[PDB]
């Protein structure tokens, strides 16, 4: 849960839950989708080439041949690829009828499913994750450093040192800035302010 | 005396008080209203504020230099 | 044009009078309203080759409240300004024995003359307004709020209600055009009253430095 996966048409997305074959929407011949990308992402960005390759891949899979999608082939209008898919028996335009997995009831709207190439980006949550608490400290400046385990914490830089003033929260600011990073008590002389 | 400050408690004095009262209860301080199935210092103390009974008096220093000193009971609970 | 000079002069004078009515100097509404054609009738067709003399536009008036204190507007006939000419006016004022007076410098003045105006620092205070500036009544422009002035007594009361030392109050510099038009001096509070949308009228009192 967290690893980036992305298609070849500009849509990049981390996983949000994973679910087992039984509790997932299933086609009426048993074909449960291995990835369920959101419908909302396609509109505003208009990648209406991801959905065409979704149709052609289905045509190619049932006809057993790598399907060519050269930028300009002229032999691939959306309609011509679709009529081939219709013979195999699917909705000419790709939709298939799925059923909710948990309840079994047919999802009313017919989901659009198909085969689409997915590339697994190198970035992973394990590399990104950082955590700190009573961590190793540099003796010279006594402000947190880094040892094993990525124990160098985040930084309260001025921008976020200023929303805190706006919220009005002084004690968090005092805690984050002093107690958390460099708490020291030094004995000071009263008549002269020099240290003692 | 002449209180010129608003009667209502300020959004931020209901925070430092709820928190201060809470460090007292956690440290074993006496409590001032019945607590039932409740062991959490903030819930025990947010309850007291509902009843206007916390033992604290708020020194609102005015801009010029004089400490008007309203008390929890007089201040109207804003929530 | 010579007719333009008449038009310009009529206006310069017209606003000049209003300043005094506002400053608190006594002026007849009739004088403020003198129409340009009336101005032509009163002073003549043109200063150049005509009755207006570049002099006589000059006038002396006293506070409506107090006749003892009078202010003499001097429109130097000489377009450029020579200190001796002011000294002549100063002598005229010494006779008048009224300290307040103003000079409508038409274009430019000797630098020495300006220091010389400061030279009579507390004597017969006089002020210089470039002719161009007086052409338009800044106080009627949209962005300019309606400045009003306060007596020393009012200033004390204001400080008391807010318990404010005067230095803490917002500050308006004397040189700014509005101040000269209301004839402000250091240490005097001019309140500003303006319409503002969230409330209605917010009156902000600003001291000068």
């Amino acid at each position: 849960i967290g690893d980036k996966f992305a298609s070849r048409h500009g849509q990049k997305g981390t996983c949000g839950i994973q679910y087992r074959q039984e509790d997932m929407p299933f086609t009426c011949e048993g074909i449960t989708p291995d990835i369920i990308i959101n419908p909302h992402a396609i509109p505003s960005r208009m990648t209406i080439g991801h959905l065409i390759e979704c149709l052609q891949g289905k045509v190619s899979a049932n006809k057993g041949e790598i399907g060519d999608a050269t930028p300009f082939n002229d032999a691939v209008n959306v309609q011509k690829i679709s009529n081939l898919l219709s013979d195999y028996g699917y909705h000419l335009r790709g939709n298939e009828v799925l059923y909710n997995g948990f309840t079994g009831r047919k999802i009313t709207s017919q989901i659009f499913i198909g085969p689409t190439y997915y590339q697994r980006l190198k970035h992973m949550v394990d590399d990104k994750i950082h955590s700190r608490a009573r961590g190793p400290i540099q003796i010279l400046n006594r402000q947190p450093m880094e040892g094993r385990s990525r124990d160098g914490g985040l930084r309260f830089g001025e921008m976020e040192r200023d929303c805190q003033i706006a919220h009005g929260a002084a004690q968090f600011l005092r805690e984050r800035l002093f107690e958390a990073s460099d708490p020291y008590q030094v004995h000071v002389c009263n008549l002269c302010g020099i240290m003692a | 005396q002449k209180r010129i400050t608003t009667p209502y408690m300020t959004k931020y004095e209901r925070a430092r008080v709820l928190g201060t009262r809470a460090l007292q209860i956690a440290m074993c301080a006496p409590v001032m209203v019945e607590l039932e199935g409740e062991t959490d210092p903030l819930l025990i103390a947010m309850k007291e504020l509902k009843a206007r009974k916390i033992p604290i008096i708020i020194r609102r220093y005015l801009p010029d230099g004089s400490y008007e000193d309203w008390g929890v009971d007089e201040l109207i609970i804003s929530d | 044009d010579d007719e333009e000079e008449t038009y310009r002069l009529w206006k310069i004078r017209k606003t000049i009078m209003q300043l005094c009515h506002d400053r608190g100097y006594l002026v007849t509404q009739d004088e403020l309203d003198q129409t340009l054609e009336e101005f032509k009738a009163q002073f003549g067709d043109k200063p150049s080759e005509g009755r207006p003399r570049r002099t006589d536009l000059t006038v002396l008036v006293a506070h409506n409240d107090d006749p003892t204190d009078q202010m003499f507007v001097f429109f130097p006939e000489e377009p450029k300004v020579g200190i001796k000419t002011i000294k002549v006016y100063c002598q005229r004022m010494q006779e008048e024995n009224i300290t307040r007076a103003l000079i409508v410098v038409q274009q430019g003045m000797t630098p020495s003359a300006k220091q010389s105006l400061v030279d009579m620092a507390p004597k017969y205070i006089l002020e210089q307004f470039l002719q161009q500036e007086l052409l338009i009544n800044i106080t009627e422009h949209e962005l300019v709020p309606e400045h009003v002035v306060m007596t020393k007594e009012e200033v004390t009361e204001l400080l008391a209600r807010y318990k404010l030392r005067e230095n803490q109050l917002p500050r308006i510099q004397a040189g700014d055009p509005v101040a000269r038009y209301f004839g402000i001096k250091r240490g005097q509070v001019v309140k500003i009253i303006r319409p503002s949308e969230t409330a209605g009228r917010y009156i902000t009192y600003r001291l000068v430095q």
Partner: protein, 147 residues
Amino acid sequence: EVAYCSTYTHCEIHPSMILGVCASIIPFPDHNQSPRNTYQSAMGKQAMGVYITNFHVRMDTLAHVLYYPQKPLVTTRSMEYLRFRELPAGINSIVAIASYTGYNQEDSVIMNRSAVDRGFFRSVFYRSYKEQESKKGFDQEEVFEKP
């Protein structure tokens, strides 16, 4: 016909050779928005897959192979030129554009626990570490021994 022109001197070999070595891995680029295709070439500089075929002897830091790289079902004609049916960078997934439980909103993909269990996208993350014996000291030797 009513020609735009009759003097054409030169005609282009195929117009889809005006796109480079990483926008030729994208089918139907014209159909997609142009910024989306730029973002995908950037994502490709990120996707893993088999790096070169001597992965076993090379030993670079940070190198990730993938268990089952698969050639794409929909292929741009000019991918073959860039050795892509020899070094593929991903797996054809039965994807289904739909809104299900909610965990798929805002660029999130739901995924089948069962399929990532039959091998779909399993990968190895090799990371090489090197230590060099130093004899810098006049008497200081960093010898190799079991302390």
